[model samples]
Target: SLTFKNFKKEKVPLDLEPSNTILETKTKLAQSISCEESQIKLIYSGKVLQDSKTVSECGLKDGDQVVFMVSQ
Candidate 1:
């Protein structure tokens, strides 16, 4: 489980597999927020996640908070 804080400051819960790629997570989040994947940016631990990286590769743990920002 993970928590995502949107630009609006609302938190959304997400359950992602360790093997899931950042791109897949982005797509899921995009759908949740009703935005395009390219329009959204995912940041964790002060670093932007690359599309090719997996959740485990990004060092994300259960209950971590990921910041979701929308590009104008």
Candidate 2:
């Protein structure tokens, strides 16, 4: 699980399976926040995530707070 915080300081919790990819995660979050998946930029450790990368590949841990930006 992870907490996605936007610029407004609001958060959305996301639970991912081992197989979950960034594109898949972004797609899910897009619906939760009602935005296009491409509009979401999920960042961690100061690195921007690639859509094809998995959470495990991103080296994310449970309860990690990720920063997400909604850009048009």
Candidate 3:
């Protein structure tokens, strides 16, 4: 896999209102991935957020500043 820096990362955010909790965020993320809610994984603050199925599930939005490093 290719690694990417946050500065050059591709981000996409939903227009819907985010849920009140992390679990709700995960549900929304699933829509971005077109997968089940259980298939997403969210990583933040060096710890994985519970019930997060994907980065999109974390409710990240376009133009949202995210500092991250991806590696294989």
Candidate 4:
């Protein structure tokens, strides 16, 4: 079980949770955004997991769960 605090809250149904790599989080975000996983940008603690690449390169997919922390 995981949970995420809405940062953007853009009404895009953005849901997130703690994850190991930033790439993983991006993948989930992209999906929710209805865009390519790579299209999603994940900023955490001031770092980017994947260096801007395709979702496949990010190495993330459905059925995979991760955790995350939120801040204002």
lDDT per prediction?
0.90, 0.90, 0.48, 0.43
What ranges in model 1 sit over 4 Å off? none
List candidate 2 segments past 4 Å from native: none
Instruction: Give all TM-scores, in the order shown.
Output: 0.92, 0.93, 0.47, 0.36
With candidate 2 superimposed using the best TM-score fit, by how many Å does residue 31's alpha carbon deviate from the native?
1.1
Name model 3 segments beyond 4 Å from true: 1-8, 14-19, 52-72
Tens-digit per-residue lDDT, 1-72, candidate 4:
222334554333334333444455556665554566554445333444464444344444544333332322
* Candidate 4 accuracy as TM-score: 0.36
Encode model 1's per-residue lDDT on 1-72: one tens digit a residue: 899997778998989999999899989988887788898788899799899999999999998999988887
1 against 3, candidate with superior TM-score: 1
- The digit string of per-residue lDDT tens for model 3 on 22-72 reads 456546555655666566555554656665344455655444433333332
The TM-score ranking, best first, is 2, 1, 3, 4
> Top TM-score: which candidate number?
2
- State the weakest 10-residue window (summed lDDT) of model 3: 63-72
- Rank the candidate models, highest lDDT first: 2, 1, 3, 4
Indicate whether candidate 1 or candidate 3 has the larger lDDT. Answer: 1
